[model samples]
Target: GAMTVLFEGCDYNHWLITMDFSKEETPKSPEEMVAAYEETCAQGLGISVEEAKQRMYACSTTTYQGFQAIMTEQESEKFKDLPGVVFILPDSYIDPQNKEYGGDKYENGVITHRP
Candidate 1:
């Protein structure tokens, strides 16, 4: 008898790259900080700064004070040890599994659900 393989699906498996500038205290202005971050991020990823910007889905100076890039595990590892890099982690995702049954209804004012 041959054994069958079952694949497990997960949403949080994707890799996320984050950069933080809080570690180093400086008097640099916002534009200067961004320049430094972009330069370092590009260098660490071995790509042009423009490419870095393209790959970045979110870059914030407030709130979390970090940048997020959805990338492959290999790409994430590449920038893990560079300057200004705070951490690299797997981005969380939610799989709403086994719900009673719910989905967006395009029709306005339409409410539906599965028993």
Candidate 2:
């Protein structure tokens, strides 16, 4: 079956942050899809694609609203107004030898720093 663009868990989190409805629905055309994505990025906190992917992955496992809520008090203030959203996607790591998918849970694909 072809995948339909869905407003899944990712979209719900956006709504919590007052995301506009116009940007949340499935795009009916290619142009619309592009626009919707641009809007989504605009709402994010200037994170790199790799960073955003990491953040999205982090959001997948938490009940946290955004990075602000997830970060420590010392860290939260630094990015209080950064645009962020969590879009959960299944981890798609496959073995090329036999084409086997092996993992316990869908890992969020975002990278983070540990200090």
Candidate 3:
């Protein structure tokens, strides 16, 4: 027999997932793009593809691209396979993670800023 059951399924945490977008080629149509996201999400999350998909892809800055999606550790792991993903973040991680990144840059400010 196989074992499973450790999930606590709704392990949703706030997350912001970013994917690649190079204007080298025109971006796909909004619907098509959302289709890709939803279908990808359907596999990762659920069948309410359009429902959640519409909400998740709720933006297209038309600059750098990516959006927010709530997920558990497992869901985020699954989305890791999404093509063009730049970085994955949960508020928990971002606070400390980006903080360190900003800290590094701020340190450089000692030499670069306060001019």
Candidate 4:
């Protein structure tokens, strides 16, 4: 259930955005290097993995801005209309249903059930 991007089975250009949480910058942890990734997982909205893989990755300012600048003509127009936008690490995943906790479905962008 990792993050990835595949537009209509065709590879789409992508980028990531990350921030440095250095003590000198944010005055946080000096020994730890913090970074964040911005990605577009729009294709995973109601489609199956057979169609696309959620693209979650470590983000950097330049990386993310570069991606934003490369939006397709069609996508560029509708970029502002996008729904949920999530940014996560490589191994991160979204579980709309908490079946494992108390619900009744395990979702990896595919397979679902209700209890």
Q: How many residue pairs clash in each candidate?
A: 0, 5, 1, 12
Per-residue C-alpha lDDT of model 4 across residues 25-48, encoded as one tens digit per residue: 455331122211122334322333
Angstrom error at residue 81, model 2: 7.3
Model 3 misplacement above 4 A: 1-12, 23-25, 29-35, 46-48, 54-58, 91-115
Q: How well does each candidate superpose onto the true structure, as a TM-score?
A: 0.55, 0.25, 0.48, 0.21
- Candidate that would win on TM-score: 1
lDDT of each: 0.52, 0.31, 0.49, 0.28
**Most lDDT-accurate candidate:** 1
Q: Write the per-residue lDDT of candidate 2 for residues 11-113, one digit (tens) a residue.
A: 1221112112234455244333323333343344354544443333221112222221122233323333533433322323246687432321112432243
Candidate 1: regions farther than 4 A off: 1-15, 22-25, 93-115
Model 1, range 1-115, lDDT digits (tens) per residue? 2797778664442444455666667766645655665676577678888776555444434333444454666666777668767767775433346321122111222223212
- What local lDDT does model 4 show for residue 20? 35
Q: On a 0 to 1 TM-score scale, where does candidate 3 land against the true structure?
A: 0.48
TM-score, cand. 1 = 0.55
In angstroms, the error of model 3 at 53 is 2.8
Worst 10 residues of 1 by lDDT: 100-109
